[PDB]
């Protein structure tokens, strides 16, 4: 009894026990190996004697040997379980390749010997955490942003939009624009300090041009921030020019439409008869959706795109940093889900391809 829920992101692992309200463990998705293995916070602690890597890139697992070390660490060191004793729900990105999902299933059953497992789409889980089975999610994390329209739990055909601009890219841009102001932020360690600045002081302008004017004509938007070396800096219009990039990806030399337009384009790939439910149920999921102002900005931009009488609602749950995980906790704990798991027996009969039958 008691299932496990592991939500694997590009930057952070969220892991815990089904039926808990929050993840037990949240830790960096990094693996370090001696110069010439450790995982997470310990790997970071020993960075001076290791080479660090992220095994997940833009939501997609790209280093499988390292990703195995992540799962081992999750089970043994973070949750303190034997994986053979617990059904394990994992998560995946929209559009994850067939091979990726087979390989996850192969590793769980052959290496971790789990008795049962399931793989759910991240945005489907977030949507479900808000108490919905229909809606369009904007899921924006450390490595990737997606627009995922969903109807009665199905991600809709050919309507998902993927954008490789998320929180890490925003930190990097804030480093660059603070460097233009006269400070210097270049190193990995400097990048972490700048991530903290971004999390604490950034926000999305309701009207970006108007906000630019207020910055240039007064100090009412300036904030101070003490660095680890004691130096106190001042940040002004960078507070909102950093997350403006989500709306104007040209700021970092990307040709993409902003997240407002990719929302609209996603909805426009869906049937006429379901678009009103999508507009009325725009759920935001992921750490990059945390900026103050983001829901109201998105409300404004979508209203400008959508048909003039369309009813629009942006939902931005207070717990949305971990809503993927939470939706997984709720789902894996449900009496009615217990027949959905892929069993060891089912895997033994059909091999890795059983995942396409069962996790749908």
């Amino acid at each position: 009894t008691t299932a496990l829920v592991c939500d694997n992101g590009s930057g952070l692992v969220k892991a815990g026990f089904a039926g808990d309200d929050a993840p037990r463990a949240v830790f960096p998705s990094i693996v370090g190996r001696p110069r010439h293995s450790y995982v997470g916070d310990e790997a970071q602690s020993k960075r001076g004697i290791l080479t660090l890597k992220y095994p997940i890139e833009h939501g997609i697992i790209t280093n499988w040997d390292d990703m195995e070390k992540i799962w081992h660490h999750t089970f043994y060191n973070e949750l303190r379980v034997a994986p053979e004793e617990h059904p394990t729900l994992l998560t995946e990105a929209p559009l994850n390749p067939k091979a990726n999902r087979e390989k996850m299933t192969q590793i769980m059953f052959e290496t971790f010997n789990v008795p049962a497992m399931y793989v759910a789409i991240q945005a489907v889980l977030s949507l479900y955490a808000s108490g919905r089975t229909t809606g369009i999610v904007l899921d924006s994390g450390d490595g990737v942003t997606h627009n995922v329209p969903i109807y009665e739990g199905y991600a809709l055909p050919h309507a998902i939009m993927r954008l490789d601009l998320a929180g890490r890219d925003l930190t990097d841009y804030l480093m660059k624009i603070l460097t233009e102001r006269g400070y210097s932020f270049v190193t990995t360690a400097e990048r972490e300090i700048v991530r903290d600045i971004k999390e604490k002081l950034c926000y999305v302008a309701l009207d970006f041009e108007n906000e630019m004017a207020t910055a240039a004509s007064s100090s009412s938007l300036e904030k101070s921030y003490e660095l680890p070396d004691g130096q106190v800096i001042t940040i002004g219009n960078e507070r909102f020019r950093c997350p403006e990039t989500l709306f104007q990806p040209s700021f970092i030399g990307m040709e993409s439409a902003g997240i407002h337009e990719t929302t609209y384009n996603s909805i426009m790939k869906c049937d006429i008869d379901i678009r009103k439910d999508l507009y009325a149920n725009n759920v935001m999921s992921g750490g990059t959706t945390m900026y103050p102002g983001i829901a109201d900005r998105m409300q404004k931009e979508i209203t400008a795109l959508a048909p003039s009488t369309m009813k629009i609602k942006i939902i931005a749950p207070p717990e949305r940093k971990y809503s993927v995980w939470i939706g997984g906790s709720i789902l894996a704990s449900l009496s009615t889900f217990q027949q959905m798991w892929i069993t060891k027996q089912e895997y033994d009969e059909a091999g890795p391809s059983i995942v396409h039958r069962k996790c749908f």
């Binding site: 009665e152 809709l156 055909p157 050919h158 790939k269 049937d271 006429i272 008869d273 039958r357 749908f360």
Partner: protein, 135 residues
């Protein structure tokens, strides 16, 4: 191709295997009806069904709903192996399995509105494959 008792038997078998298959139709590669169960009739919707089975996506939105015998279905899954439609007001679901994979024949199953089309996909897909050479 013409109906046959070899096809009749495979359908008999499917209908007993899958409780919640509440209607069946077979379209041949020429887009003509080979057979269908007596409890429904797709005949008047064949033009739009065939347009859907022949569709080549352009990243332009394609067909996202379809109607069969006055029931409108939202397409919620669309691969070369299986297409799922579901009516937005509880009037049922359809599963369309092209024969061959990605091709212009099809095994179409009408699914009990009280059931889930996810649960029938496996067998309907296998049974579409059994029909490949018959036609």
């Amino acid at each position: 191709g013409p109906m046959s008792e070899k096809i009749e038997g495979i359908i008999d078998d499917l209908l007993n295997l899958e409780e919640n298959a509440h209607g069946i139709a077979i379209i041949g590669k020429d887009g003509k009806i080979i057979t269908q169960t007596e409890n429904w009739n797709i005949s008047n919707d064949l033009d739009k069904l065939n347009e859907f089975l022949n569709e080549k996506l352009a990243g332009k939105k394609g067909i996202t709903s379809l109607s069969i015998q006055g029931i409108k279905y939202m397409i919620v899954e669309n691969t070369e192996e299986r297409k799922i439609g579901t009516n937005i007001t509880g009037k049922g679901h359809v599963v369309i399995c092209p024969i061959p994979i990605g091709g212009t024949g099809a095994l179409i199953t009408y699914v009990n509105p009280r059931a889930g089309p996810r649960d029938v996909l496996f067998n309907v897909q296998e049974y579409a494959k059994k029909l490949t050479d018959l036609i």
